[PDB]
């Protein structure tokens, strides 16, 4: 119908109007479309081959002519020229693609199925023509200019961010996908970023202090994320973040370590938190921080304890409070800066155990059992009256902290024994700061200890309660008594009972015989205290004394001087006890005669003068505590041996034949909640068991034991 030559002259003019963007007539569009339609309608044998070559030539010429204009432009010049030319070209290309839609519907679709790879849609043809003609000569200049603009923006200036976005969009769309963007822009971007940040980091660390570099680095990383969000493709996020993290932190970790040590020496919570946030982003880079923290906590604990010296050995409060302060400061540091990380709490726990179970005090006492003993003594000091009623809120916190410290002690049996003894002594003499404290401590011990120890403590409480009820009931039937069971109290039991209390003794014996049958009462006199009324003194004196002191002050009424050889027979007391109590009497400034001999003369200091009527001559004996410590330690050792032997028998009675390492491991994990045994003790127990015909060694296969009935 219509030949190609008839329309090409008008078609060229029409297409020229599409470019050089102006108002586009609402009818010229269809006027141009109709020529294409009439040309395209005149084995398939399609028609639209010739128009494609002419369109390609036209776009070729247009791109070359427009490239001649801006071959020698500068940074802002190339950016602008490229941006407006790209926008105009994209718009005009889309319009032209719309004009010639018939070709796209039939001819290119036919040629694509055949296998010809040189045929594209007209829009894709325009894009590929742009890429082949204009992109190649100007890519280096545009990229370098964009990089210079970005570098200027990095030094604190302000740039036209819309210029870079157009270039990035043009690069992304020209991948006919991200092929061009990665190999034309990202490579140079990430190559220049490394150099810039390297020189910036070196210069910053050369002059400024290391603490501010962390803030600088975090600001830099946040700025990089914002930049990628605002005028770059989203795919660059991970690569840019990784490269920046590398170049900013991984090279400087070596000095970061020393900075961490210095900021550990002087407390700086926020800075440590910032360092934790920074070094966290490096994979497997937090280990050195954990090791340094553990070593620092250990050394700080040892240094703090060693400072006190000889005083801390006999002062439970100072010894406990040093440890508590060292634990508390670093625990708060771990909660705040490091956000409850498992590794850091593990390091703190290990360090705390290390300096709690071995320090300067333990070397002074030549044993590792002094720490639980001092902790028990501190609890006893807290729970006594001590010249001031404690506040309930403050006492509970101290008890909770003590329970926290108790967790890191390996030898818990010593603490249990000493606490039991001290609680018994407190309950018998009735001097407790508050009952709520005893209840809370019993509850905590229930939670964090065994069931036999708790049973014994509860039985002690029950006995004291029933004794109080019995005393209240018996008061009306008529001085106080404390009736206790036999095996539930630790006290281990020669006294001329004065006639002043003989009637009460007989009355109470008759009462107990009447109420209960078959039960014999054993009387402990060294733990009984009361009051006295006296006549032959300056005036009415009231004094507090032990029952032995009661007898030895009531033994003399009208006589003054006595010879202790006869006094021993009079009072029925052994040598050492009588000598110690006489030394106590002399130390009380209430008697007149330190070496005691059976012929020594001791008199009474008549007209004794005292500052206050309320006098308590029942002072605690100094040597009694030192004598008791060795006895209770020996008892603890014997109990340890018995438990080890029982555990070995129990473990061998289930596994008939076992080696050495498995046996030791099983014993250690079975006894891990009470104490940590020593290998020589286990070996000695095994050797004893073999001797006593309980288990034998199999012939051959040495270092192996077998159960024998």
């Amino acid at each position: 119908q219509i030949g190609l030559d008839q329309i090409w002259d008008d078609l060229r003019a029409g297409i020229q109007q599409v470019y050089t963007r102006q108002s586009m007539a609402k009818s010229r569009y269809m006027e141009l479309y109709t020529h294409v339609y009439n040309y395209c309608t005149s084995g398939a044998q399609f028609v639209g081959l010739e128009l494609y070559k002419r369109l390609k030539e036209f776009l070729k010429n247009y791109l070359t002519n427009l490239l001649k204009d801006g071959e020698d432009l500068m940074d802002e010049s190339v950016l602008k020229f490229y941006t407006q030319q790209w926008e105009d070209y994209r718009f005009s290309s889309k319009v032209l693609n719309g004009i010639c839609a018939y070709l796209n519907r039939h001819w290119v679709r036919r040629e694509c199925d055949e296998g010809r790879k040189g045929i594209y849609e007209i829009y894709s043809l325009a894009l590929v023509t742009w890429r082949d003609c204009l992109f190649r000569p100007l890519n280096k200049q545009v990229t370098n200019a964009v990089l210079k603009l970005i570098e200027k923006e990095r030094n604190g200036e302000t740039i036209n961010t819309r210029l870079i976005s157009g270039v990035v969009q043009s690069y992304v769309e020209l991948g006919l996908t991200l092929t061009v963007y990665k190999e034309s822009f990202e490579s140079q971007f990430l190559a220049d970023t490394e150099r810039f940040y390297t020189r910036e980091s070196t210069e910053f660390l050369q002059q400024n202090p290391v603490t501010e570099y962390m803030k600088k680095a975090e600001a830099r990383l946040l700025e990089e994320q914002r930049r990628v969000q605002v005028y770059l493709h989203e795919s660059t996020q991970d690569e840019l973040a990784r490269k920046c993290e590398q170049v900013l932190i991984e090279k400087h970790l070596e000095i970061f370590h020393t900075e961490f040590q210095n900021l550990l020496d002087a407390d700086k919570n926020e800075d440590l938190g910032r360092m934790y946030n920074l070094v966290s982003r490096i994979q497997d880079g937090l280990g050195e921080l954990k090791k340094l923290l553990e070593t620092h906590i250990h050394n700080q604990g040892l240094a703090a304890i060693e400072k006190c010296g000889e005083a801390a050995l006999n002062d439970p409060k100072m010894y406990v409070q040093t440890v508590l302060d060292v634990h508390k400061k670093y625990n708060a540091l771990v909660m705040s800066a490091f956000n409850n990380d498992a590794g850091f709490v593990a390091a703190l726990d290990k360090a705390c155990g290390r300096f709690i179970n071995n320090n300067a005090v333990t070397k002074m006492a030549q044993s590792s059992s002094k720490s639980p003993e001092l902790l028990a003594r501190y609890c006893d000091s807290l729970l006594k009256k001590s010249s001031k009623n404690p506040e309930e809120a403050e006492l509970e916190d101290t008890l909770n902290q003590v329970m926290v410290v108790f967790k890191y002690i390996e030898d818990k049996d010593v603490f249990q024994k000493f606490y039991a003894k001290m609680l018994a002594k407190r309950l018998v003499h009735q001097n407790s700061a508050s009952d709520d404290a005893e209840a809370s401590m019993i509850s905590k011990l229930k939670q964090a200890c065994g069931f036999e120890y708790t049973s014994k403590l509860q039985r002690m409480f029950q006995d004291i309660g029933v004794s109080k009820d019995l005393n209240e009931q018996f008061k009306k039937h008529l001085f106080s008594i404390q009736v206790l069971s036999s095996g539930s109290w630790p006290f281990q039991q020669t006294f001329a009972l004065p006639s002043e209390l003989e009637r009460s003794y007989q009355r109470f014996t008759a009462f107990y015989a009447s109420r209960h049958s078959g039960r014999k009462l054993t009387w402990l006199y060294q733990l009984s205290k009361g009051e006295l009324v006296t006549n032959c003194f300056k005036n009415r004196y009231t004094l507090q004394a032990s029952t032995f002191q009661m007898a030895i002050l009531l033994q003399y009424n009208t006589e003054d001087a006595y010879t202790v050889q006869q006094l021993t027979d009079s009072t029925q007391i052994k040598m050492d006890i009588l000598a110690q109590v006489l030394q106590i009497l002399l130390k009380s400034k209430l008697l007149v005669l330190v070496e005691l001999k059976p012929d020594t003369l001791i008199k009474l200091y008549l007209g004794y003068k005292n500052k206050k009527l309320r006098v308590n001559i029942n002072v605690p004996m100094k040597t009694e505590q030192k004598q008791e410590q060795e006895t209770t330690h020996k008892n603890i050792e014997e109990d340890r041996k018995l438990l080890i032997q029982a555990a070995i028998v129990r473990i061998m009675k289930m596994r008939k034949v076992l080696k050495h390492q498995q046996l030791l491991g099983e014993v250690l994990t079975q006894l891990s909640s009470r104490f940590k045994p020593r290998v020589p003790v286990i070996k000695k127990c095994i050797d004893i068991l073999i001797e006593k015909e309980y288990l034998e060694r199999v012939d051959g296969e040495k270092d192996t034991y077998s159960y024998l009935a």
Partner: peptide, 11 residues
């Protein structure tokens, strides 16, 4: 005056 003694009961 007043006295506080302690004793244990056993079989």
């Amino acid at each position: 005056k007043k006295w506080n003694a302690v004793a244990l009961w056993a079989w």
